[PDB]
Subunit: 336 residues, 4 copies
């Protein structure tokens, strides 16, 4: 009913990941940026605003969650936009129809909303960022930048599996400084992924408080970017694969009492509960905000697992695991 | 430490399933399971029971059985009637299936179920007579009667073959009179499925006093009263008989997102008043109330994908209910307008 | 057409209440209502019924009756036992109360309930024998037995030889009920968890005659002895329950339980005993929020003081509601477990 | 890192409230709280924060303030404007309430908030300038602007009751607004703007759906920042503005004088049909069949916007709908300070 551009951020606490829905006032068209596999929240919000999801875009090939972009194209018959700024080996493969490979300085329109594609390598070689201008409202200046894992609140992305990426990052940071200081920064990840809890920042504020914007010695920049960065959890290589090549469409599935106990098993209860009594061979991964961060070190994508917890707790963990592209929970068992 | 017993009723299907559990061993059985096993599983968990068995009274014509799903997903033993001819009996049964005969005994832990062949509604219909032997009972407690005996009425035979069924029903009623009048009657269907009671349970003695079928002593009169004025079966009944005899895909929930094309049979889930006040052309109003399945069954084409009209949540509920009659092919939805 | 029936079971109270409804008139009755009436109301609405009546089998010792709430909030007629002496009977009753006695008949639309005085558990205990006259039935269908007859056992003389007097009345009450048709159902007021109550929600008189000890013991002395002997001490909230059910308490309303602004001498930790062992705040009492929650907290609950709870917001909201079912509305706040 | 920040938006109220928290000390503050505090509490619990503070930007006209509930239920320190005259300020406030003035600093753990008096929408309106000092920041991050600055527009002076009317009221409020805008321009252009209201209300058609903006962006696109002629500014601000719905006048009084603590309550079937009654179903359901005398107020995003024109705070009211829908509507009405739903009837 209101004619102002629609914008809403969606945050997943386990993944520490931010996706966004933008929608055009005039035409009803809408786009999801960096979608997760479960599209239901975006859909319900679009319904409530009278918007139709017709587009989806992605900042880069994610290492820490399973993208829902192919699901958007297939289930919603939407046009999708992904980076074409890659070499022949590490670029997107098996993409559906309606897939547009975008390059630096390309413009994407979502109704009257204009997004300019900026190639911002460093975190990954194909990383792109999207500069939004609300042209439907007559704006002649940009409003904000969907920065993916290029720029975070109070930090910047690390080159994933380094000097080559670090050097790319330094250059991307130098060129992004040219954008107006009043633009908002809409990052792809936040606190828990260090990273700010505040879901958004501004370019000018980052220039004042983000170390990456004040360090102009390339060698010092590279050293600080790469130095003492923890080794990535084991599930990252698998995510890169499923995001580069695609996986099965997302569907919920039943998790009933386990038929075979000889499986890698994770106990979802509190550390206090587990400590108070637990079955042997099971690994305690409490289903709190650190669940994914912890479970990635033990999760084998080529094996079925059982979970220990009550039916409801198990169904929540099951869902969260599907968000990192794991659809193979074989069953569950109650704690004794 | 007493035998566990719990009835589960689906209001759209007007169907009753049960969970019984052994107090000594923890073994439990589901009788006449629907495709979504979650409610039985949740209750079993709460009571410290493990679902190790499931049984079915007959090849249902009004909902999609979850019996095969029990055997495959829970690795439980399943018990179905082996009292059939060579063409209408259960087919393609999965691992862990046991075909039972009249007088067989099934033990769920220390609970004993005696299988009674009670044909009429269908030629293979069986009823399960329960005795709480784990409590030391020397007498039966009740009968899981499926669609043989209801509260206040009895099942109708399917389509000649209608008269043969009528005669089998008369004979089954006569045989069941010998059981104690104090046993409970646990029917397979209730109010809304013929006119069944809302009360979920009866007793043989009370049925003998109030159920017309226990007072009609003449076969010709019994038959005429049974197979006269029988309404036409809804069109989904043949599909149900087929998927219950031969099987269908395992139950899984699925996503129903905004429809890409309007080119399908489309059901509007809103109230009849809302539909009257305003609707899209080319749709069929089937309000999502207790009569939802009874109504949609006339129109549902199992060979086609359909669209629904309603908000996201209303659509998700209707989708699930449709899966209970074995329909897994909703293509998408659209908002009312 | 022609009669609705539905049992409602609360797992913490191990208590069974029922809703019956006449489909001819739309009138409905709640038997042994708890304080929160929402479930009955929702079911009545789904069935096209209007709750116009409520009845209670006796003055309950193990939960807070919602009978007075039904009377005041739904302007319904309520029926309670008038089989009492001058001091232990209902007091302060609202003007839509009807006191019933042995052999009176209550009609819910066309449904007929005959009241039977079945003393023993309490001196005023009554049972309701239902006949579905709306469907032309000329025989009874079942008995709402309250705490007189349970599945596989019978109630004990409410500890108000004083128990000996109740046990003798129980013996005569059992004797008097044997005359009813063996095919009637038995719809008890409590089930598994309250000493030896069946999980199955209903039974039949003939089945109980075969399996329930009380029906086979015909020697009065022996019966009395087995009844009153080795009976566990009741938790302390039973006396509070008898008082609020006889005199009435405030109407039920939900209320907010936010983070505690101060500590309280009675602070109950709702987590599992294993979780409590693994770490807890001192000065607290562990009462896990499982099926034995009420049976445990009853020993410690002081109705004249405010209490605190330990657990997450949602766990706390659930326990708060369960405590309101035993007439406790004074939780002051909560704190997260540390 | 050193600071938690979360916005809470009520779609029916078109209202934005915020929770900020100091990760170093655990202290946390709610800005412009609604009456139901559960959402703030749940989020604080998840983050390991303790709600120790609450502040309010001004005397609200469009929802019922939870600020007194915060002080009473949570024993928190509360901060409200003392920039009012001796008659139009807050009354009946809990003991120890802090009446803040221009330039006062409020610390939430290591987070610093500077109170800025920004009159215009109301004479007492204040805005809060946040600096993340726990993270060592030397520059402000954002401004909690209430109804002073919106995304794409600015507040209009709240109207006065006919009985206590003053001839140049809309205009002297407009002048204050022009000066408040003038003063805010000196802040860094990269600060965020965190408004108290956004899209959804006919009384703010220009308000952004985006929950936040920046000062520099508003300087480029918000008319209020480019109009430097005072007379033209005043005229545009106060000319041809729609009449506010009737509940606004009542909300202002409830907020100025306080009301009973928030508590959920039961709404059960009612047989009394001699009450003002609202039918919560869709307009098409209502058209398909309804009872005469009832007023259709569909329980959609526009529920409050529409019901404000008919709600009588002095009467008990019935609702028509199913049990669950009635309970949702009942809760939403409590968010505008109405606790007197007497019961419901199912639709016929
Ligand atoms: Cl600039
Ligand atoms: Fe990344
Ligand atoms: Fe059948
Ligand atoms: Fe009792
Ligand atoms: Fe305001
Ligand atoms: Mg510049
Ligand atoms: Mg697998
Ligand atoms: Mg038409
Ligand atoms: Mg009256
Ligand atoms: Mg200790």
């Amino acid at each position: 009913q209101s004619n102002a551009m629609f914008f809403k951020q969606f945050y997943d606490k386990h993944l520490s990941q931010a996706s966004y829905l933008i929608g055009c006032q005039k035409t009803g068209e809408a786009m999801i940026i960096d979608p997760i596999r479960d599209l239901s929240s975006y859909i319900r919000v679009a319904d409530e605003e009278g918007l139709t999801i017709t587009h989806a875009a992605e900042t880069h090939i994610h290492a820490d969650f399973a993208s829902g972009i192919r699901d958007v194209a297939i289930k919603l018959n939407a046009n999708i936009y992904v980076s074409g700024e890659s070499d022949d080996t590490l670029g997107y493969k098996n993409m559906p129809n309606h897939t547009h490979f975008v390059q630096h300085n390309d413009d994407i329109y979502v109704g009257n909303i204009k997004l300019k594609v900026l190639h911002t390598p460093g975190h990954t070689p194909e990383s792109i960022s999207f500069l939004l201008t609300d042209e439907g409202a007559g704006a002649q200046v940009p409003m904000g930048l969907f920065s993916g894992d290029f720029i975070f609140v109070g930090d910047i992305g690390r080159p994933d599996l380094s000097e080559i990426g670090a050097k790319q990052m330094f250059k991307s940071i130098e060129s992004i400084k040219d954008l107006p200081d009043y633009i908002q920064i809409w990052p792809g990840h936040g606190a828990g992924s260090s990273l700010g809890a505040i879901p958004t920042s501004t370019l000018g504020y980052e220039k004042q408080t983000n170390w990456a914007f004040s360090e102009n010695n390339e060698a010092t920049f590279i050293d600080k970017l790469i130095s003492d960065q923890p080794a990535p959890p084991h599930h990252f290589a698998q995510m890169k694969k499923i995001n580069q090549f695609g996986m099965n469409l997302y569907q919920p599935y039943t998790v009933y009492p386990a038929t075979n106990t000889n499986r890698l098993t994770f106990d979802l209860r509190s550390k206090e509960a587990y400590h108070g009594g637990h079955i042997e061979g099971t690994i305690n991964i409490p289903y709190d905000k650190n669940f994914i961060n912890q479970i990635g070190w033990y999760l084998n994508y080529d094996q079925e697992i059982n979970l220990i917890g009550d039916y409801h707790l198990v169904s929540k963990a099951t869902h969260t695991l599907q968000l990192i592209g794991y659809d193979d929970i074989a069953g569950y068992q109650l704690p004794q």
